[PDB]
């Protein structure tokens, strides 16, 4: 059931794709590979086709390519991008060189939405509800997104949202424990990002737009207060602890004064997300049950993920072993239904 491929050079890269994909037109992109928008004649939708650049160049890359393919094959949720298709022109493992990924194609991200209209409080409720619902799913597979920000959130005309572009340039949405490498970090770095996104949707202002790491830490500590002893004990680096203790102590601000005029249930949820100690931050599942989302919350329609086996991260393999495992994964891909 190998399709018919056709090859065509555009922007000095050869694209060799099944004929179901028509009207390929470049849109970038960067270090991981080039992407074209295309029309998928099987499904009737527009899609993004990504050609991986040099997927098997070193051990680090071959493993990275395998990691991304494993992750994308696994993610099956309304609010998380999934893999529509993956293919190679290769007919055998011998001859295997290129990998192409197909996904849905984002019209607008969240910045475009904010740019073309004023969001109501109800829009912010639905948008954030959908992020947390996606996140509940991701986190239940022991996956951490690590790079949530407005431009990694696709949003359509119906205000339906999907989370894109997992890690793995804007630092403003990043939890401080990872920004300054304080510790072995957990899933709630993503909740910190949601708090930053939601605060900015409510006020129109970026919450922590620091010009460098220190400046941003100072903006953050000003709002949430300097760390107490309990958090200080959990910072692994002595230099990090030492730098932190050199700061003048600062109390937590009253969030009602910071977010004047916002729905008080919104502000309350922000205080649950923007907590410096990541062990005290609200989880995605808990956030979905918050009175802020009473119009959208449905505990029977908030699924978790199948178990996701990441024991491959520990394997020590040759380039050709990563590449052959990647090939297996291309061969076993089953597309979404109808």
């Amino acid at each position: 059931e190998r399709p018919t491929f056709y090859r065509q050079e555009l922007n000095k890269t050869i694209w060799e794709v099944p004929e179901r994909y028509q009207n390929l037109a470049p849109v970038g992109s960067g270090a991981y590979g080039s992407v074209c928008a295309a029309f998928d004649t099987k499904t009737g939708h527009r899609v993004a086709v990504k050609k991986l650049s040099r997927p098997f160049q070193s051990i680090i890359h071959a493993k990275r390519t395998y990691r991304e393919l494993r992750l994308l094959k696994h993610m099956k949720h309304e609010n998380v991008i999934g893999l529509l298709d993956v293919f190679t022109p290769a007919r055998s493992l011998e001859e295997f060189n290129d990998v192409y990924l197909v996904t849905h194609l984002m019209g607008a991200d969240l910045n475009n939405i904010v740019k073309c209209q004023k969001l109501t409080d109800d829009h912010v409720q639905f948008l954030i509800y959908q992020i947390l619902r996606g996140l509940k799913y991701i986190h239940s597979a022991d996956i951490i997104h690590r790079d949530l920000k407005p431009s990694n959130l696709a949003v359509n005309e119906d205000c339906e949202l999907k989370i894109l572009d997992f890690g793995l340039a804007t630092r403003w949405y990043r939890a401080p424990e990872i920004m300054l490498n304080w510790m072995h970090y957990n899933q709630t770095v993503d909740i910190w990002s949601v708090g930053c996104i939601m605060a900015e949707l409510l006020t129109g202002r970026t919450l922590f737009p620091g010009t460098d790491h220190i400046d941003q830490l100072k903006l953050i500590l000003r709002l949430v207060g300097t760390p107490g002893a309990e958090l200080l004990k959990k910072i692994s680096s002595e230099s990090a602890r030492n730098y932190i203790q050199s700061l003048a102590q600062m109390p937590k601000m009253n969030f009602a004064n910071v977010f004047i005029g916002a729905n008080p249930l919104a502000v309350d949820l922000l205080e649950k997300m923007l907590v410096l100690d990541s062990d005290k931050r609200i989880t995605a599942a808990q956030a979905l049950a918050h009175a802020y989302f009473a119009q959208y919350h449905d505990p029977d329609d908030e699924p978790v993920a199948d178990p996701y086996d990441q024991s491959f991260e520990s394997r020590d393999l040759l380039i050709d072993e990563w590449k052959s495992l990647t090939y297996d994964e291309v061969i076993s891909f089953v597309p979404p239904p109808l």
Partner: peptide, 11 residues
């Protein structure tokens, strides 16, 4: 939450 514009003239 209803009927959004996706695209608009500015920047």
């Amino acid at each position: 939450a209803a009927d959004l514009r996706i695209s608009c003239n500015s920047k």
